[PDB]
Amino acid sequence: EAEAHKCDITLQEIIKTLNSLTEQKTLCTELTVTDIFAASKDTTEKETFCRAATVLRQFYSHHEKDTRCLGATAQQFHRHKQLIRFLKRLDRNLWGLAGLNSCPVKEADQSTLENFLERLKTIMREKYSKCSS
């Protein structure tokens, strides 16, 4: 089924979705998140995708039905379901390519969902330029 590669087209749409996840960078990113980009000795690109894929998992399960991220507006609701569908999509498109179920992401200080979403985009733009071989 593969022809050229599974990193130019698939991962490409995964990067665009990455920037879309930074739309709610104010009320939903006020909580926190492990800093996987705080001390990365020498992990792999597929291991980094699964790690951030687990953190994103809990982000689309509870924060989608939590009131802390809801707010208090009729338009904020219709816009919320939009970020929940884009996030759950990247959940399988990020690690689905990695190939690693076990992903112990419980070793890091309490970073912020903001600085983490920024380092997520950057990491996808410089690391995605090394999938070919």
Curated annotation (Swiss-Prot):
GO terms for molecular function: cytokine activity; growth factor activity; interleukin-4 receptor binding. One of its GO terms (cellular component) is extracellular space. It comes from the Eukaryota. It is found in: Secreted. Interacts with IL4R. Interacts with IL13RA1. Cytokine secreted primarily by mast cells, T-cells, eosinophils, and basophils that plays a role in regulating antibody production, hematopoiesis and inflammation, and the development of effector T-cell responses. Induces the expression of class II MHC molecules on resting B-cells. Enhances both secretion and cell surface expression of IgE and IgG1. Also regulates the expression of the low affinity Fc receptor for IgE (CD23) on both lymphocytes and monocytes. Positively regulates IL31RA expression in macrophages. Belongs to the IL-4/IL-13 family. This is Interleukin-4. It comes from Homo sapiens (Human).
